[PDB]
Amino acid sequence: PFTEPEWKIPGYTGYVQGLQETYKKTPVMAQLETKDPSPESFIYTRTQTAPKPSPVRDPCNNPENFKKPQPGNLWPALQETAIQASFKPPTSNIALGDERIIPFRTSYGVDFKAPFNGTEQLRSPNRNEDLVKTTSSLTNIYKSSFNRVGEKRLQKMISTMRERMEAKLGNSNNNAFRMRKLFKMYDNDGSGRVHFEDFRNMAETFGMQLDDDSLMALYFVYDPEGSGYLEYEALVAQLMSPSDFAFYKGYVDYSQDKADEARRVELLSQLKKKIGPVAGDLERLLKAFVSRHDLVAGCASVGVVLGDKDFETLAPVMTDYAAFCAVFN
Amino acid sequence: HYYLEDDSVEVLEINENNSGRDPFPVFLKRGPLPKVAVKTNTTLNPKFRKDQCYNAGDFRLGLFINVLGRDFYLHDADTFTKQWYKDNLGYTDEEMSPVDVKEPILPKPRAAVPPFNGYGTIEDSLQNCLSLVPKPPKRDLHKLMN
Amino acid sequence: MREIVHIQGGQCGNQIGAKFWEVVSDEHGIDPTGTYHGDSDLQLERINVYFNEATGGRYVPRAILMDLEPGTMDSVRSGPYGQIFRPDNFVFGQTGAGNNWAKGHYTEGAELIDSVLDVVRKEAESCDCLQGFQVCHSLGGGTGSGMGTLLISKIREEYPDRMMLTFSVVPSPKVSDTVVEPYNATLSVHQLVENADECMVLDNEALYDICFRTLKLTTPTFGDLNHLISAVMSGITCCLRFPGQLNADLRKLAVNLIPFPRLHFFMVGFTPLTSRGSQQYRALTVPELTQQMWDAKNMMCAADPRHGRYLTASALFRGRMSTKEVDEQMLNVQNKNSSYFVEWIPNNVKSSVCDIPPKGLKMSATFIGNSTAIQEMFKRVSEQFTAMFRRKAFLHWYTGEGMDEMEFTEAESNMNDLVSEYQQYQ
Amino acid sequence: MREIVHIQGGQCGNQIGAKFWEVVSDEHGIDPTGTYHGDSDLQLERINVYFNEATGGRYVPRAILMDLEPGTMDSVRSGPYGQIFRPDNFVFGQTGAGNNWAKGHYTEGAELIDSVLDVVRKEAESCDCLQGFQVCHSLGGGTGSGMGTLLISKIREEYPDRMMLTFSVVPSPKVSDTVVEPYNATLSVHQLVENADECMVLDNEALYDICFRTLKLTTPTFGDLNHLISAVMSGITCCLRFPGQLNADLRKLAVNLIPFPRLHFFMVGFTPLTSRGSQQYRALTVPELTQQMWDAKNMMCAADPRHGRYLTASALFRGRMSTKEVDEQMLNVQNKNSSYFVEWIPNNVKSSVCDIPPKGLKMSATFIGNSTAIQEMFKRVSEQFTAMFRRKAFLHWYTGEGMDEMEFTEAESNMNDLVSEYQQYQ
Amino acid sequence: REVISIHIGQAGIQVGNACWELYCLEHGIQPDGQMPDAFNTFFSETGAGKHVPRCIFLDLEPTVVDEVRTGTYRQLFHPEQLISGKEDAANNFARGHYTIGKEIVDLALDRIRKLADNCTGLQGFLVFNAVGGGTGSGLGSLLLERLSVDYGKKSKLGFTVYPSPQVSTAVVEPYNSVLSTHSLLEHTDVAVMLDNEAIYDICRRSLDIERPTYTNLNRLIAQVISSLTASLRFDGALNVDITEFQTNLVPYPRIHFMLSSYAPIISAEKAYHEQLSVAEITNAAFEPASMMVKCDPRHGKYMACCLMYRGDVVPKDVNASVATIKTKRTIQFVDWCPTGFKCGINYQPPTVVPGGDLAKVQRAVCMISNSTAIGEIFSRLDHKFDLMYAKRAFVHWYVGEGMEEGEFSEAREDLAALEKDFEEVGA
Ligand SMILES: Nc1nc2c(ncn2[C@@H]2O[C@H](COP(=O)(O)OP(=O)(O)OP(=O)(O)O)[C@@H](O)[C@H]2O)c(=O)[nH]1
Ligand SMILES: Nc1nc2c(ncn2[C@@H]2O[C@H](COP(=O)(O)OP(=O)(O)O)[C@@H](O)[C@H]2O)c(=O)[nH]1
Ligand SMILES: Nc1nc2c(ncn2[C@@H]2O[C@H](COP(=O)(O)OP(=O)(O)O)[C@@H](O)[C@H]2O)c(=O)[nH]1
Ligand SMILES: [Mg+2]
């Protein structure tokens, strides 16, 4: 029980630090909330959460505030440009609260947690307990299962599960939420690993209806180890269409930066195509010679045009004639 | 402000335009800093001796100052202060160099230009996504005539 | 599921629409490039109300920006979240009305609202089950007031079975921007009293005084005003977007706040609103919210309710709360100041709770009050409209386009009978 | 449970409060940055009396600052323990009174009181069970005398069923700070005796000889005088915040102190006072603490308590003591100089014992005197009034803003009778 | 011996959500659907290692149901027993009773029928609804109407969330309340009030919760439900099925309005020190400060009482306690019924919900009484309903839905008739 002097009487009118933040909880459980808090409560996030940085609102990042501004020339003759800089519309920055508050803790999710330590496992009705008895040499079970099924049958299985997932999200503006209902939603420890009965369960919630022998075949393919965990990011990419796979992924970068790097990789790949076949004699010529101006003479003599735009694409690669022609090889 | 006349300290708060803070000129009264915790007596406000209090030799441009529990990180100094430190405390030029308390801000994503639909030409098609009101493209008549 | 289509009109509507879509993009965690960046899965299940999926996880809004001048469109695509709008949703003329309600209601509409009707109809039947429409515009400017007003007429004549919210800015005589504020305000309100379902009166006077007193900003721009009304609009749509202990949809709020079909003018307040220098010193508790909410200096209208009476009221609470302290505070504010309420209706206050506060906040409340103090505002506008119409100022720029005098007369009669019926229920 | 509101008006009353909240915030162990750093849990037991946790453990004092000139709003916020007062609680004027009781009570009192009435009333509902009120202000100033006593009258009207503690400085003949002392002193006294429940008068000349002769300070700056006054005020509310053998709250004081509703002008005293030069040559015992109490050189009022009698008094002890030693020490002093106490009352003195001595000591007391030698003060100020009033000097500053001579005539009338009833009982 | 539970409205679903959580916890059912015969009355056994409840949630808004769908008990309620429309009724009996019902009620009816048919020894129906909100009130009355014309002979016990006298969450609550009761009278067999301020103060007073929420109330309600259905669920020295409630508490076809009280309401801090005997818990179940309905039986007169006992109870002591209650004249009985008690005893002591507040107890008593304070309650509701109706407020909503003032007039007079009825029977 809680009999220490630190816990207080229910009929206690003295002050307790942080009792105006508790709710729906008895006094002693409230006193447990303040001292040893659970992650869900505000008393936890006010003490043990790192502060999120909002760097644009910091007055320190603006260096003109440290010194008072000094007057410059405002004579029309003693000038160099006749366009004063246009005032930018000031951004709407009004701080209303600390950014540490992750607000997504629904009431039901807090009131109706799995009310025991072993019930959140959520087993399936049909399951093979012998496989959770950690029997010896799980890899042999994988090999035997895959040799019993045959590889041509998994291709049929993935194809028909593709047809089912294609058939599920018919038309709605919430179809991505149901796609996330496969693995990522009912998931913690965002490392994408799924155990075998959990996989069978998430599959039957959608209607795959996989028997264990076909199930362990998928694992011999997608997990050739004794770990027994599956990387669903590799798997569901085959079931989903590529246009809707992004919805399941949640975040795909469409940045102009990423596009420019995709441009850079395309230019360097084209130039690799260019110097590739003729790379064999360029190294011999360069060793027969290193400066860039000398490299132009070498590259032009051997047969490839090398210009300023070539040097700007090759600037991130080198600076070495040896490693240069090697990465060209 | 460290007043060499009285060895007192005064912390002025600077204000930014449209800050959320009420304007208050001063942040700490002009009294000598304690620098230590002293067992207070309820009758007599403590008499602080110079040895207990801070000295001009304590600020080292990169250190933390325990100002009443607050830990200010001082990061610059005026030209007169730098000169004074070199003159009187034999500091080197490099110590007086200001340390930069600056943190970066990351740009926004600013999504890329879409790849072109294979109907028009690249140049005539880029305008539709570039601007709202489509403008015809421009040519190098400079090179044309020449 | 339950669908809200957004409509923004005029320069003001464009800007507050941009800020509203900014805060909505924030609360659903979508980046300025249109891809999800959030963590909790609570955000994906209710994005259908405001976003339509297109391709590769690109949620675009179900909104219609409407205007007449390209400068507002440049302002839209300049700022952040300006490249998440579909270019087909920028229905936009070329000429510009310029504070003429007649140009706003007869000439440029004849060539604009047809295309607007097309895009909104395509956007209506793109989703299945509407909750209704939400409109944000002005009453003083031309291209927002009249055009949006005719659009309000046309949508009510096609679809009467959907809900309708109108956030309109009304002029105040101290913050008096335009000259013909009466000539366009009366004609707009004369139309929306028969067309609009319910209205939320906004104005810049109370809002400026709120940023001065309660927020202590020295030079607040319009954008901060837009951010406050943006928080207001998110607070009124929070129920359909997030679960809670007691949900209250828009129809629920209308039926609990409108006792008579011509009594549909509310007063809006928002909490909590404290300067960031004063953020650190105060607590965050239910009476601490309630005291700020029921105060007269927190309303977003230039009407002191202590000069009038409340008909009905509503409070929307966001954040994990204690319903007991919610309704006991409502009961206490209803009991202590008992003179400021109507008599023939007990329990004038509707309350609801959703379990998701806005990002960065812990616990908030949005207040909608149907009071009779709004007739003071309409009276203030009526007397000036009479002052002008007594000897026919500025009239010809209206009569020379298709309007006549009986439009003014019927407008004056509607507002006068309205302020008399508000005074009667007081 | 019980909650104290602290009100700091004037220039004098303001600075003392800043020194008060230092010694209080020290005992409960909160540090100048607002974070609790006490060790024992007998300190958090009653932290609500003087503070509220806001969020992040930042305890803010429940006190109102009030003045009319921006000078004090710096010299409070700036000084140590200045970063804890709520920036909302800095309700504040703009002009400044300047020794004119009219301007502080009739001109600015029109537009400032409801502003300071706002936050005070608000803070009243902020706490659960008001214990009472507690004001610190001058009697010779403009804002402390005008805006203080005006608030005093106003708050009694709203809250009649609460106590009232006024820590007031009074003028002195030789150390004349202003020239209109007898005006503003009289005009406040005629205001206090009806609304203020018990007035703990203070002065400076009686503290200078205390700082000079007992504490043997050579440079007794205000930081020292204000520290003594800060000690007594904390000693009054001792039993509300700590356990003890015999508790004495605010009202338990007044019942044993006020035999007639108008004989309620106390003198205060504090022990033990020695210079740090001789701290360790003396003994700290109840036999010794007492002979420092009942000494005449140890009051904080320039009225030799030997020139009258004591109607009643009270002794608030702190620290572990033996009550039998207290009660017989309070007995001998009542019998040996029996000619100084009143004959028609038994048990002239109430003693009470808390269980925690103040930080920096091990045993402390606090003497509170309802003696009749306090009439020698009002005599001095009243008779001065006639000297100026016979010549109507300085009058037109007063009657230049609405006040009339008849009010002055009553100040004579009011003062001269309460110095009569004092004299009737001696 | 099975009972089929139905839950209507935003309240009904939440009450069922807490009620079913308790049921699974008691019978030892993991929230996956199976354990690691007494359950036959609630959990049908399909296939192997599966327990699906004979329950239905129905609602017009999809929010709370989808929440239930994706919460912790996803595998338990299989996705077809939870009916969800596309838009709510929004505090309107009319929109609920005529427009939206005509599309929801048929599917609800055709679903319960095949649930009843799969059941074998069906005992009756148990309905939890909220008449304050449109979704419950209107559609609930519509469902009960179709329920009566279908079966009729089977019992229907109705637990309704009426409005509290002073504290309220809505405005059109009186309209919806009266429009519900006008049909709730003739369709519900035994009605039981579950007001909210009543439980707020109870939780505040007894379990010293400073700032509670609906879930604390829902858990206490579910505790009440389990304690009165325990007789069917388990074996005791003297049990009573649901057919006994109406037999021993309904002396007249239209006098069916019960008041509920529970004991002991004790948190863990007070449990250790309080000696809990059947005497004081039977005493505590009689105070007006311990009732699920905001009323005062002092002003009223009991008509009949029913006492369910759970746990270690020897029938000697319960007999002694009912006798000393009968002899104490602080409460007074009617003369229309001299021997006005029914008793029922079950051995199984209540269970503890981890996340609740009630400590594990040896014994518990649930009292169900009929009185005249209910007639006082209905009139107090009527007064303020007419206060609003006299001015024809909010009625444009209802006539726009399609109804008329006639239903308003008939509900007002029906309440008046019930008023006069309860006054008369009180003598
Ligand atoms: N005790 C208790 N009362 C509840 C609960 N949920 C809702 N209520 C009550 O239900 C009333 C509102 O009715 P709702 O059920 O929310 O709404 P509805 O009946 O579904 O009808 P609509 O809102 O129009 O869809 C409020 O006054 C609450 O007091 C609950 O879980 N426990
Ligand atoms: N709050 C707010 N008000 C605005 C904004 N822009 C314009 N307004 C108000 O709108 C009114 C003028 O609207 P106007 O631009 O003429 O509308 P339009 O001409 O029909 O497009 C003025 O009273 C402004 O105060 C804004 O960004 N925020
Ligand atoms: N003990 C003490 N007295 C003070 C202090 N400051 C001012 N006074 C007294 O206050 C009186 C002047 O008050 P005043 O400034 O006129 O008050 P106000 O102008 O109305 O705000 C003088 O007699 C001083 O003795 C202080 O810090 N300590
Ligand atoms: Mg509902």
**DSSP-derived secondary structure for D1-21:** -EEEEEEEESSHHHHHHHHHH
Interacting residues of E339 by C-beta distance below 8 A, sequence separation 6+: none
C324/E10 touch (CB, cutoff 8 Å), yes or no: no
Percentages (nearest 5) of helix, strand, coil residues in chain E: 45, 15, 35
Q: What type of residue is C201?
A: V
Ligand showing the shortest atom-to-Cα distance for residue D65: 3
Q: Which atom of ligand 3 is nearest to the CA of D19?
A: 27
Q: What type of residue is E88?
A: D
Percentages (nearest 5) of helix, strand, coil residues in chain C: 45, 20, 35
| Contact between residue E209 and residue A26 where contact means Cβ atoms under 8 Å apart | yes
DSSP reduced 3-state for E361? coil
- The CA distance from C295 to D275, in Å, is 54
The residues lining ligand 2, judged by C-beta closer than 6 Å to any ligand atom, are C 10-12, 15-16, 99, 138, 140-145, 169, 171, 177, 204, 222, 225-226
Strands (E) across C81-203 are located at 90-92, 129-138, 163-169, 198-202
Q: Is the preceding omega at residue D272 within 30 degrees of 0, hence cis?
A: yes
- CA distance, residue B112 to nearest chain A CA (Å): 4
Nearest CA in chain A to B15: A65
- CA distance, residue E275 to nearest chain A CA (Å): 18
- Token output for A108: 């039901």
Q: Which of C218, C222, C278 has the highest number of chain B CBs within 10 A, making it the mutation to test binding with B?
A: C218
- The CA distance from A92 to A273, in Å, is 50
Nearest CA in chain E to A21: E211
Q: Is the preceding omega at residue C272 within 30 degrees of 0, hence cis?
A: yes
- The CA distance from E229 to E218, in Å, is 16
- The CA distance from D12 to E206, in Å, is 51
H or E element that contains B125 = helix B122-130
**In chain D, which residues touch A (CB < 8 A)?**
1, 36, 44-48, 53, 55-57
Q: In this complex, which of A101, A177, A251 lies closest to C362 when CB atoms are compared?
A: A101
Interacting residues of B3 by C-beta distance below 8 A, sequence separation 6+: B9, B10, B30
- The CA distance from A227 to A219, in Å, is 10
Give all chains having 3 or more CB-to-CB distances under 8 Å with chain E.
Answer: A, C
Q: Is E9 in the pocket of ligand 1 (CB under 6 A)?
A: yes
Contacts 24+ apart (CB under 8 A), C53-56: C53/A173, C53/A175, C53/A176, C53/A247, C55/A243, C56/A243, C56/A246, C56/A247, C56/A252, C56/A254
Interface of B with A in 2-21 (CB under 8 A): 14, 16, 18-20
A17/D1 touch (CB, cutoff 8 Å), yes or no: no
- The CA distance from E69 to E75, in Å, is 9
| Contact between residue E321 and residue E279 where contact means Cβ atoms under 8 Å apart | yes
Residue reference for tokens 């005026």? B78
| Contact between residue C7 and residue C62 where contact means Cβ atoms under 8 Å apart | no
- Catalytic machinery residues of E: 244
Residue A157 at interface with chain C, using a CB cutoff of 8 Å? no
Q: In this complex, which of E21, E68, E208 lies closest to A10 when CB atoms are compared?
A: E208
- Token output for B68: 């009443």
- The CA distance from E261 to E241, in Å, is 19
Cα angle E198, E202, E203; round to 5: 120
Residue A134 at interface with chain D, using a CB cutoff of 8 Å? no
Residue C331 at interface with chain E, using a CB cutoff of 8 Å? yes
| Contact between residue D92 and residue D73 where contact means Cβ atoms under 8 Å apart | yes
Question: Cβ contacts (< 8 Å) between A109 and chain E: which residues?
Answer: 71-72
Residue A11 at interface with chain D, using a CB cutoff of 8 Å? no
- CA distance, residue B93 to nearest chain C CA (Å): 39
- The CA distance from A72 to C198, in Å, is 56
> Ligand 3 pocket: which of D107, D169, D221 to mutate (most atoms <8 Å of CB)?
D169
DSSP reduced 3-state for D350? strand
- Token output for C6: 């957004």
Are chains C and B in contact at 3+ CB pairs closer than 8 Å? yes
Assign 3-class secondary structure to A37-88. Answer: CCCCCHHHHCCCCCCCCCHHHCHHHCHHHCCCCCCCCCCCCCCCCCCCCCCC
A125/E213 touch (CB, cutoff 8 Å), yes or no: no
Interacting residues of D221 by C-beta distance below 8 A, sequence separation 6+: none
- Token output for A270: 């084209």
Cα angle C36, C38, C43; round to 5: 85
Q: Which atom of ligand 1 is nearest to the CA of E215?
A: 31
Question: Cβ contacts (< 8 Å) between C278 and chain D: which residues?
Answer: 86-88
Annotated binding site of E for Mg(2+): 61
φ, ψ (nearest 5 deg) of residue E266: -135, 130
Question: Cβ contacts (< 8 Å) between C22 and chain B: which residues?
Answer: none
Instruction: Kindly state the DSSP code that residue C279 receives in the 8-state scheme.
Output: T
| Contact between residue E207 and residue E267 where contact means Cβ atoms under 8 Å apart | yes
C202 CA to middle of ligand 2, Å? Answer: 11
Q: Which residues of E234-263 are buried (b: 16+ CB within 10 A; e: fewer)?
A: eebeebbbbeebbebbbbeeebbbbbbbbb
Please name the residue whose Cα sits nearest to atom 15 of ligand 3: D11
Q: In this complex, which of A15, A17, A20 lies closest to D46 when CB atoms are compared?
A: A15
CB pairs under 8 A between A and E: 83
Interacting residues of E322 by C-beta distance below 8 A, sequence separation 6+: E282, E307, E341, E343
- The CA distance from C38 to C29, in Å, is 5
- The CA distance from E315 to B118, in Å, is 89
Q: In this complex, which of B26, B40, B45 lies closest to D78 when CB atoms are compared?
A: B26
| Contact between residue D224 and residue D260 where contact means Cβ atoms under 8 Å apart | no
The experimental method behind these coordinates is cryo-EM
Q: What resolution in angstroms does the PDB record give?
A: 3.4
E48/A181 touch (CB, cutoff 8 Å), yes or no: no
Beta-bridge partner residues of B3: B8
Q: Is E415 in the pocket of ligand 1 (CB under 6 A)?
A: no
Residue reference for tokens 């769908």? E69
B109/C32 touch (CB, cutoff 8 Å), yes or no: yes
In a 13 Å sphere around the CA of A113, the CA atoms on its Cβ side amount to 11
- The CA distance from D258 to D236, in Å, is 16
Q: Is the dihedral of CA C28, C30, C31, C33 positive or negative?
A: negative
Ligand 4 being an ion, which residues bring their Cβ within 5 A of it?
A: E 10, 133, 135
D55/C287 touch (CB, cutoff 8 Å), yes or no: no
- The CA distance from D210 to D299, in Å, is 9
Interface of C with B in 361-420 (CB under 8 A): none
Residue reference for tokens 């008690």? E341
Interacting residues of C4 by C-beta distance below 8 A, sequence separation 6+: C49, C50, C62, C130, C131, C132, C133, C134, C237, C240
- The CA distance from C59 to C85, in Å, is 9
